[PDB]
Amino acid sequence: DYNYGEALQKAIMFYEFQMSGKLPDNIRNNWRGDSCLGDGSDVGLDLTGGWFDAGDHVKFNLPMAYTATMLAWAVYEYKDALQKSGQLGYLMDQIKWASDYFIRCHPEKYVYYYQVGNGDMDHRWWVPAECIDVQAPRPSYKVDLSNPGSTVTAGTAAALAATALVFKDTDPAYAALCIRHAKELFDFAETTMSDKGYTAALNFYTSHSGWYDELSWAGAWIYLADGDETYLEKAEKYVDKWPIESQTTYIAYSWGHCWDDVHYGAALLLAKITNKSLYKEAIERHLDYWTVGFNGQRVRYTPKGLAHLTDWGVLRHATTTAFLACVYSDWSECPREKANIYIDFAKKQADYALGSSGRSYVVGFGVNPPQHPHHRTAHSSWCDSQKVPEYHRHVLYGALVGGPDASDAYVDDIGNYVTNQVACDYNAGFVGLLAKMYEKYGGNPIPNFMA
Ligand SMILES: OC[C@H]1O[C@@H](O[C@H]2[C@H](O)[C@@H](O)[C@H](O)O[C@@H]2CO)[C@H](O)[C@@H](O)[C@@H]1O
Ligand SMILES: [Ca+2]
């Protein structure tokens, strides 16, 4: 069996490498430094902090909020296992880092900054984070009542709500602040019902599923953290505008939970909150189709056992769906026979990410892991070139790469930003999955681990 403690410890550490702004003194690596300290200067605000999205240095607040919410979800479900591993403190520190940044992006009730950095310009430069802000300006982008962005504002509300949920027992003052910001951002999103202003992320993180599942997503997290039934009532109200499986009348089920489509996770949380069969059927339709099949149709699988939804961030999809299987299979209302099927599914997907096919797909872990992730700072080029140096100067511990194709084929290639891609959302659900696997199978993390 694989060391799920070591994997978990590193999958969490991966986020330290993504940090932007003035780093705290408690960081565990010696190669990341302060960066992009002027973020927000163009609008008179302190918009520093947060995570760089992927191997670039743009801060995209839609996938960032998604990542924070999933990280908080891991704590919510597997707090005790995360403490026993000794990594709960690090994971909590990262959640607050992202949420602190979301709060700074919300200086007024109906003004939310959703992006720092221009996508096209930032991607022209292959330079480390500590040098990026000298090469090109980093403008701030915002939405308001006249140019609204309901998807991203609702997504950030979910993140702050989930943050308040896990910080309420340790820092109630901080939890109260996050809740206040979440309900404001929720009201902002619900009032505008539009993405007319969400324009800086076009061609990078444009959603087509709609902001309504983001509303149910946020409404459930607000209720779990605050108990205000008003936001549970609003969550169930917008279920009828979730995506529907084509050629049917079911709630969509043949995709997966991801930064673009959160109605999957929303259905799981609403099932646990309300115990209604509407949500239980929807999530069980999804997890059934992803395992044994539903109505004679089944998600594609590679011969080596990987659930292969699509070629873009395939492992992000498998590990994330696997995490949902963990949470639901551990639920008391889950049919027992379906529980064993779902959890065996989760272990196989986890083991595939860790090296069941013959090689780890987690940088710096296991056998023959990827060594050339499409990541500017870990590569650390001295001349604006992906090819120079020919080896990464730094190890991007814990990063889950895009993954192999449908025939289990994969090759290291710093230039392939699909197969060798890494990103915040790729590791989000992965943490939750490993937390469960550690709880069940153990495997001790590296003591005193430093990068
Ligand atoms: O936005 C996804 C991905 O983009 C990467 O930049 C690409 C860019 O999208 C493409 O149009 C251009 O031709 O090539 C660059 C890379 O050479 C970016 O490097 C990634 O960080 C980002 O995740
Ligand atoms: Ca959506």
UniProtKB/TrEMBL annotation:
Sorted UniProt keywords: Calcium, Carbohydrate metabolism, Cellulose degradation, Glycosidase, Hydrolase, Metal-binding, Polysaccharide degradation, Signal
Annotated EC: 3.2.1.-
One example of a Gene Ontology biological process annotation: cellulose catabolic process
Record: active site: H374, D412, Q421
Binding annotation for Ca(2+) 1: S209, G210, D213, E214
Positions of Ca(2+) 2 binding: S209, G210, D213, D260
Catalysis: reaction(s): Endohydrolysis of (1->4)-beta-D-glucosidic linkages in cellulose, lichenin and cereal beta-D-glucans
Positions in coiled-coil regions: none
Gene Ontology MF terms in the entry: cellulase activity; cellulose binding; metal ion binding
Origin: domain of life: Bacteria
Keyword Signal: yes
Protein family membership: Belongs to the glycosyl hydrolase 9 (cellulase E) family.
Descriptive protein name: Glucanase
